[PDB]
Design a binder for this molecule. Structure first.
Ligand SMILES: O=C1c2ccc(Nc3ccc(F)cc3F)cc2CCc2ccc(OC[C@H](O)CO)cc21
Ligand SMILES: CCCCCCCCO[C@@H]1O[C@H](CO)[C@@H](O)[C@H](O)[C@H]1O
Ligand SMILES: CCCCCCCCO[C@@H]1O[C@H](CO)[C@@H](O)[C@H](O)[C@H]1O
Length: 343
């Protein structure tokens, strides 16, 4: 147990072990806020996230445990991971606060457009890194569900890491634009290629410099999607159980599929080809993360000997209805049992 010190930053109070110096606010999300700091022990620049009100309620309590159990498991260079987790508290009885530490990264993909086009070779490297971490996350049976630009952390080296949650507020971007259609129609079931649609939307935005589907609401969103990929045929229509949605889609001016080739004019025809394969309405035919790595577009990066899969991940807790106290005590066990990686 190290020596802690306190500081106030933006009316958040921070209590941290002194190894972390020069705390500097970077921003906040719904579930906590994030500081940049210097880790004197390791010599690295780090991001420390103070969870906000971890244990306000069964929802929060279970979310905190989820996050701690999630980030403890991720060990892959395209997936954010844990350098440290700590609590200022000395017993379970006084346990209230969770801090999580990771590599400082310095920006998010939202922040490294400036509304602008990147060259074909950054796109390749970027979408590559995303898919590479995606292969890994999916191999653990996890589905991200909310892959968007702000959920992607990138450094000066154009090295990229998938965040669990990115920042809504920066000290110094709508979900729906990137959501697979099956999720917008509240399908009670999906597969992992839900994230692939998202990668498609991101990719598209990088090559063109503009959002693929800037829907003003969830209905507008679908209208936009259908315009590009065309209204669904019968074999897809047979699969929607809900009359209201079916009736809506069928009540639409039926639209043909566009020539992606005419819409992504200018782009590496290989790029274009990958898009076709990611942005298919029917989740059964979208290319997977592991398949897309083998798509020619990534030839200068692909290496199946260096595209690792994850240890299997116990998600049984996801189905349990426990008390705040139990959820709390589980999280605590996880703070306590934390093994840091080697430097
Ligand atoms: O690196 C970044 C990062 C890192 C982590 C994290 N959440 C998180 C997740 C898990 C964990 F354990 C600890 C955590 F902090 C969220 C982000 C947000 C994207 C971002 C945006 C801007 C940045 O720098 C602005 C400065 O001004 C320097 O230029 C840095 C980062
Ligand atoms: C760190 C790599 C693992 C990524 C897993 C992301 C875990 C976040 O789970 C999130 O909870 C939200 C709140 O209801 C959901 O709506 C989002 O779809 C989901 O991404
Ligand atoms: C934009 C409106 C079109 C809606 C079509 C979305 C197609 C969703 O795709 C469906 O995913 C299901 C699981 O989620 C699978 O059981 C189906 O086979 C698959 O077609």
């Amino acid at each position: 147990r190290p020596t802690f010190y306190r500081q106030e930053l933006n009316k958040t109070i921070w209590e941290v072990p002194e190894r972390y110096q020069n705390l500097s606010p970077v921003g906040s999300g719904a579930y906590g806020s994030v500081c940049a700091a210097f880790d004197t022990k390791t010599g690295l620049r780090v991001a420390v996230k103070k969870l906000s009100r971890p244990f306000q309620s069964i929802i929060h309590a279970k979310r905190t445990y989820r996050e701690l159990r999630l980030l403890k498991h991720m060990k892959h260079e395209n997936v954010i991971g844990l350098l440290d987790v700590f609590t200022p508290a000395r017993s379970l009885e006084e346990f209230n606060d969770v801090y999580l530490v990771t590599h400082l990264m310095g920006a998010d993909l939202n922040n490294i457009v400036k509304c602008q086009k990147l060259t074909d070779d950054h796109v390749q490297f970027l979408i590559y890194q995303i898919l590479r971490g995606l292969k890994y996350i999916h191999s653990a049976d996890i589905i991200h569900r909310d892959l968007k630009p702000s959920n992607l952390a990138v450094n000066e080296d154009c090295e990229l890491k998938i965040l669990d949650f990115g920042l809504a507020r920066h000290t110094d971007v709508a979900t729906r634009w990137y959501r697979a259609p099956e999720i917008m129609l509240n399908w009670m079931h999906y597969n992992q290629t839900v994230d692939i649609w998202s990668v498609g939307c991101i990719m598209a935005e990088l090559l063109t410099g503009r959002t693929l589907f800037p829907g003003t609401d969830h209905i507008d969103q679908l209208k936009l999607i259908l315009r590009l990929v065309g209204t669904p045929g019968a074999e897809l229509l047979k699969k929607i159980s809900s009359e209201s949605a079916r009736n809506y889609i069928q009540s639409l001016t039926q639209m043909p599929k566009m020539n992606f080739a005419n819409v992504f004019i200018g782009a590496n025809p290989l790029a274009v080809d990958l898009l076709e394969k990611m942005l298919v309405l029917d989740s059964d035919k979208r290319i997977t993360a592991a398949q897309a790595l083998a798509h020619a577009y990534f030839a200068q990066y692909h290496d199946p000997d260096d595209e690792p899969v994850a240890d299997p991940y116990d998600q049984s807790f996801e189905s349990r209805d426990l008390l705040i106290d139990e959820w709390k005590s589980l999280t605590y066990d996880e703070v306590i049992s934390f093994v840091p990686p080697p430097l």
